[model samples]
Target: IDYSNYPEFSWDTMPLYMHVRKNTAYTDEEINYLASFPLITLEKSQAQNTYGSTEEGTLATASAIKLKNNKAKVLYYRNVVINWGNYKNDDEFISKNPSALLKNQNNELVYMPNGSTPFFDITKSFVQEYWLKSVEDMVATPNIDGTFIDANIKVLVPSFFSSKVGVNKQAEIENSYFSMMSRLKESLSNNLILANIIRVRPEFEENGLEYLGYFNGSYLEGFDSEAFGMSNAEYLVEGIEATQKAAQSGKIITMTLGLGEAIDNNTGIDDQREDVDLNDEELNKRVDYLLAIFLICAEKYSYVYLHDGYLATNSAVWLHQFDQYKKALGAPLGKAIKNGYIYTRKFENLDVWLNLETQTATLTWK
Candidate 1:
């Protein structure tokens, strides 16, 4: 189970991703604590928040994050619906092209994934111009790593567009998403641009191959576990094929796992918010079971965050996991170990094995 001599990369984070709000004012205490992680989402609204403050001072400066933190890290957040909060009316958003807003046969704005916020027929010049402005603003921040383009997945989902809008124009719609990403990529060629692809799907994977060249990386919320706990079956390898494929393509991949409990009883775990902080014992058990899933895909651009619950950024219990953790696994040496009920991902210096039947994990390294 020891493979070596291949290029090996390293990082310092065990569920180290963090999230902050735009409206909330964070003191130096909050900023310093947050900066300790590898990746953090600095939620911002054009009207309310920025890294430091919206003033012409540090907070207003996009470079504030790089000025504040010394770690090799990433600082970015949400970009939903063309800054709907700033403008006063829908026409302000879609006046240039009446059809900019995606609509059904009924001529109403096609409801998007997140909300009824303005969605564009990304192919439209106005849509591109609006999004370009937002993106241009982000890259201009000078200190920002990149921003997540929210609602990007809506275009890929069939439910987001009706037959009138998407039936005859599937290719154009799909290409529009990729085309927008390509333009955005060129806009921030010097910095990283990651997308909130949500999760990879068989249908969504169509033309998805082009996505590799469009964005520098991707942010995956949940692709493992039965719901929020360990998966019901040994679907470790198959479940992460897309991420592994992305990793193999030399793309940075970040995954967020809600390890607290399952929502809607998808798994055996009870219903709980993504921020539910599990007890130390339970947290360790959950981390033990799935943390390896991240390690198996370990590359220079790979990371994982254990979203144990709301505002559960850096708990003593969570930090303790890193105290006993290794930073790299060289590479996945071969196929996962599937021995009846025990599953394993073998690497050069690490072995991630889990037993679905017993609800236990065996993580070991040299």
Candidate 2:
């Protein structure tokens, strides 16, 4: 659920209601009321989560939760909660407290919590132990489909290059984070362990944890700002290259982009249309060209996770163009998996290129 504007409300604004209403019979007026909002336009049918009405204790949400458990066959969902210099006291959490692990400087074993220095500190142990407990708790929970460790690791400074933090600190933290995730993966066994990080660093690939790629959270702020430095076409190309590099080791690389940013009338990817410097007619043409590029990338890429309907619809429109490209390329576009909240199109005419082990989808234009 990514939006350009700070969302005014929570669950009420969720697009799940639209999907739920779709399956249940409703008056045309009721349907119109639901569709009146711009948010509904961007939701992916497959990602929609339904909840039972007030009379039914919201069984739909429960059922979806249950389905995730059965589908992933794992227990507990844990999220890594870190406080990188955001807190004033820094003594709140066991792993985050500067006093607990900062003592006895050992550059080889630990690194500074958020500082740019490469020197190792003892705090690395605390960070690892804290993350390990998070995984353990998830494994102990019922109906949990594995744990998601948020990898929002940051340096004490603004930019990594500009900051004084040395490469050694980065390496130490990366090693600690990767080692923890690996152990969790082995311990969970049947359960899935996902590490949600800001950017896909090259060093992490060398360490050997399954890469899930970058999660593009909503606007072009913070980490996303870095990506905005390049044009969409260039960005997509770079992303493809990065994905390919990670895929070499039987790892998965999926992207999560803005659904809301692509749609909303007042605030959308169109708002940034000026950045690309195109007039109305040129804008449409650029969109068409972008669509072509998106389709080609999608065909070659493994997974496409649309943030919401805006992204889904826009991508779909572009995907249509991509289908046209397939015909031109003399490739066969395979059958698409259209579920309630998401749709996956496969290419059929090309060489058998599906990587089942890594869940890579092979696509042809024909």
Candidate 3:
């Protein structure tokens, strides 16, 4: 893919991507708004009634966006293992093959932490076939350019499935996940695989860099999450390093940073974990801080998504583009220079200064 032809692939302006998904088909006004972003991921549970199937609704939404912005690329959302509802096509497949769903040690259905939704047992050959084939058919359409693969974190965590499937079986499940993803990449025809697989975690080596090879790029969330007893700044610096390397390598990065204050037991990716006060006068300061962190790591093809949460209907910034986003960013002069806990960078139209230690930053626009 020659990404050079698109405006979103450059740093001339603040490159953005829409990470919105709801249960209804987008209104014309909403579709018009979505068209403004260069990249987007239409999540599962789109209006099944209006579009006949979730896949159909997704393609329809993508097609609507393309009609408004031909350069925009949209990804069809699919979970790696979790069986999210509203996927009519997948439901039909499971009806014919009931064994595709995973079962626990007691022969009970394996469920996510939510305790109701089930997951697929990728260890089974037929399950893998169904997953791969469905994606293949969707990306075959012109509007559906690729897939947004979610739940890699859930599947990769060693203890996540251990209690349900047992230790030995958990290992097999992990191995099968790798094989299925490898096959998905090899089998897909000219489609992007943007995964929710990269993060700074104690268990993952180099913050999931080892697995970046399986996808065209990665969608980042929980960037500020405290993990494994690490201090906030310590974890953030590691994440910055990993994100910088990936961005500079030209891998597509959709970095979603929350706007609210942190909460207890927060994974940083959970939508409700942050207390985002939209009326706060200091909100721009938070935006500047998050944007500064992103700019320090951003490169061509790296897009920023600043939001209070994931759900568009409840999101404060869903339709409201920030004042910072409207500013001229020009191209980066060079890579950011780091000095201990502070980072400074120059752009043609801006200057960025960040203090990771203090969790504060300033973006000086020319």
Candidate 4:
């Protein structure tokens, strides 16, 4: 795929993008703020309030952003395998074909342990067709540039589905995922398809780097969290390397880090971390650590999103851009120099230093 045609990007202004929380409509102020980024993901359910459905709302939001910044590429959000509600069209389709709802051995709906979200049986041809066509129609709109697909880790990882669907069914589902993605790559026009596919886990070979071939790029989470037998530092180092590899290869990398203390066995939930006020000193400390790591790994299209959570309504960060983002960040002078668990890099206007072992970082701005 000619990724050059996917999204127009630059290193100016912190190389940022936003994965906005799911909401019905944004105020004019909110829309203007969102338009500042060269790319944005209109999260699932964003269009439900005013536009009547996710698809329509997504389109409406995309148009609104484009009207403010024509160059801003907006991606419509969709869960790759999770059957998240709010898409009216998908609801109607599933209503007609009840078989699309994947069930467990007991004929109970398979639930994501995090939020109990249901899974779509993409192993079926009809389900794949419906998903692909729905996404295709959305991207075909002039305002919609591409798609932001989530829940890829749930589908590709073996143990994630094995217990609920049986080992044999899990293997079948994995194979079907590969097939669906290949078809999705073909079906979508010159649009970007970024998936929440990368994470550092024992279950993922090469920490999810192996799946990079299927999409234009990856949307990263669980960067600082530790789980699946890896220490927080181990997981973070691997994540940094993998993210750097992808970003340096010109892939669009959106790395979202939670600005709070890291947790073991993180459920990718917002409130799961130790709570802290936005103005708390610890929050800034965590932000510096994550941001320094990001500067080390970031390439031209690599964007950093540091937030306490994904839901705007529940987050102290919603509608408010951090002061860290306002700093003048010139282009990197060179890649980060590493020694043991420490990494240091220089940019035109700042110097970044981070120590993974100590979980501390410092940024010196000119």
For each candidate, give its TM-score against the true structure: 0.73, 0.43, 0.93, 0.93
lDDT of 4 at 88: 93
Report the lDDT tens digits of candidate 1 across residue range 140-255.
66556666565555566554454446565545666766777777777767666667663534445432434556666677653543442444553344446566677667676667
lDDT of 3 by residue, 1-366 (tens): 435423357677788877877667788999999998888888777656678778778888889999999878888888888888778878888889778888976677988675689989889998988888888888888887788898888778777788788888889889999998988878763678899877887778878778888888889887887767788888788889999999887788989888875566544333344647866558888899999999999988889988866666777777788888988999999999999889999999999999989888998999
* Weakest 10 consecutive residues of candidate 1 by summed lDDT: 1-10
Candidate with best TM-score: 3
RMSD, each candidate, Å?
6.1, 13.8, 2.1, 2.3
Backbone clashes per model, in order? 6, 32, 0, 1
lDDT of 3: 0.82
Q: Measured by TM-score, how close is model 2 to the native structure?
A: 0.43
lDDT of 3 at 323: 84
Q: After superposition, how far is residue 103 of candidate 2 from its true place, in Å?
A: 11
lDDT of prediction 2: 0.32
- Please give the TM-score that candidate 1 achieves against the real structure: 0.73
Best by the lDDT measure: 3
Per-residue lDDT value at 129 in model 1: 74
Residue 218 in candidate 4 has what lDDT? 93
User: Model 3 — which ten-residue stretch has the worst lDDT?
Assistant: 266-275
